[PDB]
Amino acid sequence: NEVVTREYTINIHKRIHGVGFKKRAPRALKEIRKFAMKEMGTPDVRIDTRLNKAVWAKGIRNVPYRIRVRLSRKRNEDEDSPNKLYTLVTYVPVTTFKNLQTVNVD
Amino acid sequence: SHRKFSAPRHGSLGFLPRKRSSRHRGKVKSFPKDDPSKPVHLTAFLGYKAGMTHIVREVDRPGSKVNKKEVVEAVTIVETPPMVVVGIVGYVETPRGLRTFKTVFAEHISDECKRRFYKNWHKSKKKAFTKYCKKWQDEDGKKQLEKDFSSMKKYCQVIRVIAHTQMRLLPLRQKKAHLMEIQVNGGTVAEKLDWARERLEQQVPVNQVFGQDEMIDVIGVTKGKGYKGVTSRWHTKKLPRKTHRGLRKVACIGAWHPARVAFSVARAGQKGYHHRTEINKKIYKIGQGYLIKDGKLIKNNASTDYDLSDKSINPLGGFVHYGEVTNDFVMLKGCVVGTKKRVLTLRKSLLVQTKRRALEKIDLKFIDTTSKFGHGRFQTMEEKKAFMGPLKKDRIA
RNA sequence: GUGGAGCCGCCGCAGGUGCAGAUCUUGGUGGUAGUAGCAAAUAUUCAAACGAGAACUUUGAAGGCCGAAGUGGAGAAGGG
RNA sequence: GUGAACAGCCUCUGGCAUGUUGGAACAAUGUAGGUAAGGGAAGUCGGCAAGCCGGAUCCGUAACUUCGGGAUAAGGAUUG
RNA sequence: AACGAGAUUCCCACUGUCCCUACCUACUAUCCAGCGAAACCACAGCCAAGGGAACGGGCUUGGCGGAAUCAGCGGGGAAAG
RNA sequence: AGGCGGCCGCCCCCUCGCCCGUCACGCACCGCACGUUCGUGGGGAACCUGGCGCUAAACCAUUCGUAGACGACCUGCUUCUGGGUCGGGGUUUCGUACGUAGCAGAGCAGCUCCCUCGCUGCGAUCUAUUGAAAGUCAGCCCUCGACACAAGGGUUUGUC
Ligand SMILES: [Mg+2]
Ligand SMILES: [Mg+2]
């Protein structure tokens, strides 16, 4: 039940592969969800709108090969589910992915 | 009636239940039948194929046009770390066949045998053979464990050896040893049993079992191709283009009056992943892999008398989908049953032969270790950056 | 045992007088079977809101199609 | 916009949610679209089907003829 | 002569029509959530021979004969219409 | 298909463990069937019950991709040679990135030091940086650099 926040590179080129042209960027957002419900640990994965714009910025079938995201574990409120934590995955733009590894922002 | 044009059967009816085999490890259906006049030895050995390369050799063959010339040959290589003997089995001959008399396992058993005795090593309490190892040490169990050898010596007449592989020395993921059960073909059954009491829980290398330019069998499970149709599983001819409801089908599958489809007809199902035995594969080289650290790591594989270059048989870029061979190997002329990383059991041939292709001495001249992960054109990393020169790789000093 | 207002024996009388069939007539129910199927015209995604409840509603954002002989704007017959 | 063009293809105004469902997988057989070494009708009742050729500019065009044609004959060269 | 979505024969060019097949793509088939029919049906459903309305699934004599099922398949049901 | 058998040493014990003869009684149930054995057979279920012993493993979920239509199959999941994600290398594919620099550039325009390489601008390309850039396991190879993560579940299974 932490409040931690890390940032990550997701190469989508490994993670959607052999997918047909019209199911290619829509899977690229449920593989970000499957990444984020694996690592922060909670099923309620939220992603913001400016990351939906980030993956879809080149049509469906040409997803950018790698994106830089950050995952924020936060807790919920107001007559909540038996899941009481949610993850906000928001989009951080960057210019180079070389020698960028999983750091822990505080 | 009477096809007007003769043509033979498609496919063989001797492999007819084209079925997924019930085993991943190839089963020796028949070890070589012995006489006790020979010295004592093993007959079979487990190995893992890594991939293929090719070779160049000065082939000696009088009469042929191949004589005294260089001729390339496809070769597979099989990574074989030494086995480790665990058990002794005894088989008594009956009028119903062989029957296991009893087994004796080793005094203390490795990690990777014990992992083969479970379906979930994680959830297990790791408890197999824990009460069996305590009859080697108590006074009462020890005198009736060596009584089970003296009763083995009296009655049963063919004895075998349970040995497993050392998966720790291998680049795979598996870490379960493959537990084989292989027949000793020595002299009398007292010397045949004392040769295995001497050497429980000890290593048996691959050069002790096989020899160079000697011809063996290969037993394994084939590449699995899945559920495939009539024209691919059975190589049946396609129908013409104009055919309604389909091209890749066999058209007639029987006459009227046998009112019943036959086993001899071709129809769709599982293709591949079948248990097969290739016969008469010649060993080209017994490898020795990555020895002592006095000279820090002598690679020295694939370095023939005509090469004299510090090479190693693992190709430039590594074996594709396999890893990197750090152990002993046996390389075999030609194609071999199985995917890469698949357990295949090498075995001395039953039949004797002369044939002038067996018993010939092969002397290598060249093994390429070029990149199989593309159209590679260099053979060592020293050779490339001599030709390629400096790059933008270092670019700091 | 259910049921809740009619019913039967004998002597005579009189028939629209007794079903297994007619690819019978009408009504009902199976098995096939949770099966065939819900595949013509490129495509959906994120967040939010109202709600017991959202792949489909709405709203914003992105990505697409029609592409002015239109999937646009109005009519005639027809509908009501 | 391209172009000879109310062709085709792409966009703006204006419309729409992919045409009575969604998810996962990517076996056979199919339906629809490609590609194939060497040979080039040997396939077949039959060159069926598919593929070649294709626009425009500069030349150059036979037999035959009802003198009109054939004729974009055929056969080349070029193209940013 | 000209013109034929007319019939035919040859030649050039071209090509998976063929030698001789192989691989890739979409939509399915396939599995799941929901929804869900119809033709058909004496009883049913493993064979060999015999006899028989002369070509049995049942009958005679033999062979033999384990639940429950899935994706296919086109021999049979002298399959359905 | 030994599951059965032989021998011996000590021991609570018998001295009738047989045949012939003597003496005399026990349900003699009053004519009657399923009597008499194997046998404290086999199987199941629980109770009162002394002693000696034992403290698991399957399947699902998750993972893998040597496997697969679906099931099935091959594997991983230790609190550190555990394997997962990023990063780095290796391998390889295509063919030299953007930007900057140029006395490279068919020429053309302007200005004036009217200027026989005067200067500047426009300009496909070309040269240098640049065997560069970009991709690379998703079913490539080696990593043990950095981040975490792991015992967290679910369903059942016993031999009078
Ligand atoms: Mg045998
Ligand atoms: Mg063949």
Helix orientation angle between B147-155 and B189-197, rounded to the nearest 10 degrees: 150
Continuous segment of H or E residues that includes residue B192: helix B189-197
Q: What experimental approach yielded this model?
A: cryo-EM
Whether any strand C atom is under 7 angstroms from the Cβ of A29: the reply reads yes
DSSP B323: B
Count Cβ atoms below 10 Å from residue B209 Cβ, excluding itself: 22
Continuous segment of H or E residues that includes residue B246: none
Whether any strand F atom is under 7 angstroms from the Cβ of B97: the reply reads no
Measured from the alpha carbon of residue B32, the closest ligand is: 1
Q: What is the distance in angstroms measured between the alpha-carbon CA of B259 and the sugar C1' of E45?
A: 14
Whether any strand F atom is under 7 angstroms from the Cβ of B145: the reply reads no
Count Cβ atoms below 10 Å from residue B239 Cβ, excluding itself: 16
Continuous segment of H or E residues that includes residue B368: none
Record the resolution, in angstroms: 3.1
For A99-105, the CB contacts below 8 A with 24+ separation are: A100/A9, A100/A68, A101/A9, A102/A6, A102/A7, A102/A8, A102/A9, A103/A6, A103/A7, A104/A4, A104/A5, A104/A6, A105/A5, A105/A6, A105/A7, A105/A70
Contact B317, B380 (CB under 8 A): no
- Tracing tokens 């939906």 back to the chain, one arrives at A52
Q: Which nucleotide is nearest to B370 (CA to C1')?
A: F91
Count Cβ atoms below 10 Å from residue A21 Cβ, excluding itself: 10
Q: Which of B85, B101, B75 is nearest to B45 (CA)?
A: B85
Q: What is the distance between the alpha carbons of residues B237 and B249, in angstroms, rounded to a whole number?
A: 8
Considering only residues 46-75 of protein chain A, which place a Cβ less than 7 A from any atom of strand F? Answer: 65-66
How close are the terminal C-alpha atoms of chain A, in Å? 16
- Tracing tokens 């480790």 back to the chain, one arrives at B84
Q: What is the distance between the alpha carbons of residues B379 and B315, in angstroms, rounded to a whole number?
A: 7
Q: What is the distance in angstroms measured between the alpha-carbon CA of B12 and the sugar C1' of E31?
A: 34
Please enumerate in sequence order all residues whose Cβ is within 8 A of that of B214, keeping only pairs 6 or more positions apart, or say none: B282, B283, B348
Q: What is the distance in angstroms measured between the alpha-carbon CA of B147 and the sugar C1' of F50?
A: 35
Task: Tell me, in angstroms, the distance from the centre of ligand 1 to residue B29's CA.
Answer: 5
Whether any strand E atom is under 7 angstroms from the Cβ of B259: the reply reads yes
Q: Which of B289, B283, B284, B307 is nearest to B366 (CA)?
A: B307
Residue length, chain A? Answer: 106
Q: What is the distance between the alpha carbons of residues B81 and B61, in angstroms, rounded to a whole number?
A: 34
Q: What is the distance between the alpha carbons of residues B282 and B15, in angstroms, rounded to a whole number?
A: 25
SS3 content of chain A, % helix, strand, coil (to 5): 30, 25, 45
In angstroms, the Cα distances linking B360 to B179, B211, B276, B304, B329 are 34, 13, 26, 18, 21
Q: Which of B26, B13, B15, B31 is nearest to B275 (CA)?
A: B26
In angstroms, the Cα distances linking B168 to B78, B172, B288, B380, B390 are 16, 9, 17, 27, 38
- Positions of chain F reached by protein Cβ under 7 A: 1-2, 55-61, 64, 66-69, 72-78, 81, 83-88, 90-93, 130-143, 145-149, 151, 153-154
In angstroms, the Cα distances linking B367 to B230, B313, B316, B341 are 40, 8, 12, 21
Q: What is the distance between the alpha carbons of residues B332 and B279, in angstroms, rounded to a whole number?
A: 12
Question: Which sign, positive or negative, has the C-alpha torsion A50, A56, A58, A59?
Answer: negative
Q: What is the distance between the alpha carbons of residues B205 and B186, in angstroms, rounded to a whole number?
A: 18
Tokens of A50: 């400016």
